[PDB]
Design an enzyme around this catalytic site. Structure first.
Site, mmCIF file in Angstrom:
data_model
loop_
_atom_site.group_PDB
_atom_site.id
_atom_site.type_symbol
_atom_site.label_atom_id
_atom_site.label_comp_id
_atom_site.label_asym_id
_atom_site.label_seq_id
_atom_site.Cartn_x
_atom_site.Cartn_y
_atom_site.Cartn_z
ATOM 1 N N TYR A 1 -66.414 122.337 -63.111
ATOM 2 C CA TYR A 1 -67.089 121.473 -62.824
ATOM 3 C C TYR A 1 -68.211 120.914 -63.950
ATOM 4 O O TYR A 1 -68.515 122.002 -64.578
ATOM 5 C CB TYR A 1 -68.191 121.886 -61.338
ATOM 6 C CG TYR A 1 -67.305 122.099 -60.107
ATOM 7 C CD1 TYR A 1 -66.974 120.882 -59.403
ATOM 8 C CD2 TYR A 1 -66.943 123.309 -59.878
ATOM 9 C CE1 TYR A 1 -66.090 120.975 -58.387
ATOM 10 C CE2 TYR A 1 -65.768 123.383 -58.827
ATOM 11 C CZ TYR A 1 -65.500 122.213 -57.994
ATOM 12 O OH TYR A 1 -64.649 122.419 -57.077
ATOM 13 N N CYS B 1 -60.923 112.047 -69.291
ATOM 14 C CA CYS B 1 -60.576 113.094 -68.069
ATOM 15 C C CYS B 1 -60.238 112.570 -66.762
ATOM 16 O O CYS B 1 -60.774 111.638 -66.386
ATOM 17 C CB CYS B 1 -62.188 113.679 -68.033
ATOM 18 S SG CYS B 1 -61.979 115.220 -67.038
HETATM 19 C C1 LIG Z 1 -63.776 119.354 -66.820
HETATM 20 C C2 LIG Z 1 -63.852 119.108 -65.403
HETATM 21 C C3 LIG Z 1 -64.992 118.950 -64.640
HETATM 22 C C4 LIG Z 1 -64.938 118.464 -63.327
HETATM 23 N N1 LIG Z 1 -66.047 118.283 -62.469
HETATM 24 C C5 LIG Z 1 -66.099 117.953 -61.186
HETATM 25 C C6 LIG Z 1 -67.279 117.594 -60.738
HETATM 26 O O1 LIG Z 1 -68.573 117.403 -61.100
HETATM 27 N N2 LIG Z 1 -67.058 117.127 -59.336
HETATM 28 C C7 LIG Z 1 -65.819 117.448 -58.780
HETATM 29 O O2 LIG Z 1 -65.891 116.922 -57.450
HETATM 30 N N3 LIG Z 1 -64.723 117.598 -59.331
HETATM 31 C C8 LIG Z 1 -64.876 117.964 -60.434
HETATM 32 N N4 LIG Z 1 -63.581 118.521 -61.038
HETATM 33 C C9 LIG Z 1 -62.766 118.657 -60.287
HETATM 34 C C10 LIG Z 1 -62.338 120.213 -59.771
HETATM 35 O O3 LIG Z 1 -62.052 121.027 -61.008
HETATM 36 C C11 LIG Z 1 -61.323 120.365 -58.258
HETATM 37 O O4 LIG Z 1 -60.265 120.084 -59.070
HETATM 38 C C12 LIG Z 1 -62.003 119.617 -57.218
HETATM 39 O O5 LIG Z 1 -63.003 120.031 -56.956
HETATM 40 C C13 LIG Z 1 -60.887 119.691 -56.158
HETATM 41 O O6 LIG Z 1 -60.532 121.048 -56.001
HETATM 42 P P1 LIG Z 1 -59.984 121.680 -54.619
HETATM 43 O O7 LIG Z 1 -60.039 123.127 -54.710
HETATM 44 O O8 LIG Z 1 -60.988 121.143 -53.509
HETATM 45 O O9 LIG Z 1 -58.583 121.051 -54.443
HETATM 46 P P2 LIG Z 1 -57.298 121.674 -54.628
HETATM 47 O O10 LIG Z 1 -57.066 122.687 -53.317
HETATM 48 O O11 LIG Z 1 -57.254 122.128 -55.885
HETATM 49 O O12 LIG Z 1 -56.342 120.535 -54.187
HETATM 50 C C14 LIG Z 1 -55.515 119.963 -55.427
HETATM 51 C C15 LIG Z 1 -55.394 118.347 -55.351
HETATM 52 O O13 LIG Z 1 -55.144 118.150 -54.185
HETATM 53 C C16 LIG Z 1 -55.688 116.714 -53.812
HETATM 54 N N5 LIG Z 1 -56.304 116.310 -52.462
HETATM 55 C C17 LIG Z 1 -56.108 117.764 -51.633
HETATM 56 N N6 LIG Z 1 -56.629 117.428 -50.450
HETATM 57 C C18 LIG Z 1 -56.975 115.900 -50.455
HETATM 58 C C19 LIG Z 1 -57.268 115.210 -49.599
HETATM 59 N N7 LIG Z 1 -57.914 115.419 -48.352
HETATM 60 N N8 LIG Z 1 -57.411 113.934 -50.077
HETATM 61 C C20 LIG Z 1 -57.062 113.460 -51.249
HETATM 62 N N9 LIG Z 1 -56.484 114.169 -52.279
HETATM 63 C C21 LIG Z 1 -56.623 115.507 -51.689
HETATM 64 C C22 LIG Z 1 -56.958 116.378 -54.941
HETATM 65 O O14 LIG Z 1 -56.254 115.602 -55.830
HETATM 66 C C23 LIG Z 1 -57.028 117.881 -55.567
HETATM 67 O O15 LIG Z 1 -57.245 117.939 -56.694
HETATM 68 C C24 LIG Z 1 -63.826 118.699 -62.572
HETATM 69 C C25 LIG Z 1 -62.542 118.963 -63.233
HETATM 70 C C26 LIG Z 1 -62.432 119.370 -64.587
HETATM 71 C C27 LIG Z 1 -61.310 119.827 -65.334
#
Ligand SMILES: Cc1cc2nc3c(=O)[nH]c(=O)nc-3n(C[C@H](O)[C@H](O)[C@H](O)COP(=O)(O)OP(=O)(O)OC[C@H]3O[C@@H](n4cnc5c(N)ncnc54)[C@H](O)[C@@H]3O)c2cc1C
Length: 262
Positions: A60, A234
């Site tokens: 994040y 990004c």
């Molecule tokens: C440098 C960096 C900075 C970041 N900063 C932020 C930030 O400030 N805020 C932020 O929110 N995230 C940010 N992210 C993204 C963050 O790291 C996560 O990938 C994000 O929070 C989603 O993770 P998760 O565990 O909820 O989803 P995961 O379980 O990892 O699911 C993988 C992917 O499935 C997709 N997905 C799953 N369910 C759904 C759904 N209901 N609808 C649509 N798509 C879906 C999404 O594309 C998701 O990324 C950043 C990433 C990087 C690399």
């Protein structure tokens, strides 16, 4: 002494959980004390984790940085279960965060990253160092907050004259993060920044681009390469590899040297 220590997992307590919209929440996490420096250099991010009933960790970029002492704010898109047919389980860590109550904790590790915008008009990328006058930014979805951190570091500095162009891609207009904030930055620094948006499926009253990022969109929204101009990116890996880098390469940029990914 800063809060962030790249060798340690540091506990941070949730102080406020504030809805931005139906599926975007701001999480305000306290540092060790309310006057503590975060210690997050511009261009870097943090890893946030929690042990649940399994240790789950995600990157994040907070919407606050060293200018804000005693806490950091995270703006998080919540990927809820049983909304999207392709992803019925939703997002693992965004739902973990959404389920947190004020007083609960997470562990924070950082700073993370190879790119450092260390002083007005200058950056370091791994071992390389250079002056910079113009920065293109291409973000997709949650890829916005690394761009937003750099935009604020540049625009809020009374001695930095670096210019910025942002191209922000999302599936729908509803998915655009921090739109009022982005518009307010463009309004309050009109000669230093421009912001352009694209959505896959637009509505009739949409004043920006439609579809995937292409050469025409990059030429309209971004600076062409000249010494002193870099592009930072990004977003989802397919968007970067297939829609961005090919088009920046055509505009004179070079992957890993003048086109840098967060
Ligand atoms: C440098 C960096 C900075 C970041 N900063 C932020 C930030 O400030 N805020 C932020 O929110 N995230 C940010 N992210 C993204 C963050 O790291 C996560 O990938 C994000 O929070 C989603 O993770 P998760 O565990 O909820 O989803 P995961 O379980 O990892 O699911 C993988 C992917 O499935 C997709 N997905 C799953 N369910 C759904 C759904 N209901 N609808 C649509 N798509 C879906 C999404 O594309 C998701 O990324 C950043 C990433 C990087 C690399």
């Amino acid at each position: 002494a800063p809060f962030l220590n790249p060798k340690k997992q540091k506990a941070a307590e949730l102080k406020e959980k504030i809805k931005i919209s139906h599926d975007v929440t701001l999480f305000r996490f306290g540092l060790e004390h309310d006057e503590q420096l975060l210690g997050l250099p511009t261009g870097k991010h943090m890893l946030i984790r929690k042990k649940v009933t399994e240790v789950v960790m995600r990157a994040y970029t907070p919407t606050t940085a060293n200018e804000t002492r005693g806490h950091f704010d995270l703006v998080v898109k919540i990927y809820k279960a049983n909304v999207h047919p392709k992803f019925p389980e939703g997002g693992k860590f965004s739902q973990i965060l959404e389920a947190l109550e004020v007083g609960d904790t997470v562990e924070v590790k950082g700073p993370i990253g190879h790119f450092h915008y260390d002083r007005p008009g200058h950056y370091k990328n791994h071992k390389l160092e250079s002056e910079v006058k113009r920065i293109n930014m291409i973000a997709g979805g949650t890829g916005l907050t690394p761009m937003y951190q750099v935009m604020k570091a540049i625009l809020s500095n009374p001695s930095d004259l670096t210019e910025i162009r942002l191209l922000y891609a999302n599936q729908t207009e509803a998915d655009i993060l921090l739109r009022p904030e982005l518009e307010a930055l463009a309004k309050s620094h009109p000669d230093r920044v421009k912001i352009h948006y694209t959505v896959d499926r637009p509505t009739p009253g949409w004043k920006y681009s439609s579809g995937f990022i292409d050469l025409d969109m990059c030429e309209r929204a971004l600076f062409r390469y000249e010494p002193g101009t870099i592009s930072v990116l990004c977003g989802p890996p397919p968007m970067l590899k297939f829609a961005c880098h090919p088009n920046l390469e055509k505009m004179g940029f070079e992957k890993g040297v003048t086109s840098i990914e967060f």
